[PDB]
């Protein structure tokens, strides 16, 4: 995507869809890669801080992320546990947003795809616009959830 | 669910063999998401009875080993459906094949069939036939799934896919 404008990205958000490239990214409740997204909040730095949630030492843990701006407009570099890129393919800023993140040493074995959306509702275009995306890449496990799981903590 | 090869009939003879579970999709997450999930089984082939049932060679991950079993699926007045004595599946349902190359199954509980509804895309060699996941995906769209897996080559040559 050409551009994102951060300040327009802030708020609340919900993990409504997730896709890996490996299984075992996602296939647990504690899987490295299951992450829930909750807010968005532009830092003074100009950076973009991620709240999120992931299930962890028995527990639903918050994590605080740190997205930096690249000289790709689209693509943010984070310092995470597992992950070190993150990529937005698609946003209207106002319902849904696309994105995916991986680990740039393993690009294919680390790859994962979320649906993000404004509200814990299921936005079927925003399932569209997921899946036609994920149509192009390499991807063994799908997850959707429900809104009585978004509303709920680690779903 | 529509079992669409109950209109054009069921014959267990053709499908007998080898078969690969290429592809699994779940209602409920936490019925097929773990390696040892519930529903999590790899079918390993098809074998009609003199009864006319089906014997099913089936894989399952216990315990951090993975494990055999036979399962006899028993045949109904309508085709393409059987009766399977499970703890909490006890149907299985022929949706699609070609005998050749792919055969779409679902497994329900008819006591809670939307919670308990799982299927699969078996394919007769482990290869990725994007036909058959096709099929496959065109059978999802009418079914309330929530978790979606699919396997490599070599995790289909390997026991319970590991
Ligand atoms: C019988 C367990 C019910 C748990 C419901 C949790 C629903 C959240 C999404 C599925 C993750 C759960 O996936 S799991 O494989 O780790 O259980
Ligand atoms: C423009 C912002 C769009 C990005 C929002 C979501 C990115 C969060 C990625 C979590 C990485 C998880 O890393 S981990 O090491 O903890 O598994
Ligand atoms: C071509 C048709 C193949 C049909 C295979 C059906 C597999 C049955 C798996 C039941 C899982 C067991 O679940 S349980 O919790 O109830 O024991």
Redesign the pocket.
Known sequence: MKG?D?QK?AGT?YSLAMAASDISLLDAQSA??R?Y?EE?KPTPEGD?E?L?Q?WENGECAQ?K?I?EKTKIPAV?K?D????NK?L?LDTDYKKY?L?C?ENSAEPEQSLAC?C?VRTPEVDDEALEKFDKALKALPMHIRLSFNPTQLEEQCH
């Open positions: 994102l951060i990205v958000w490295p890669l992450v997204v968005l973009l991620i999120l992931k994590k992320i997205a943010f984070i995470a546990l597992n992950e993150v937005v947003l994105f993140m979320q993000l």
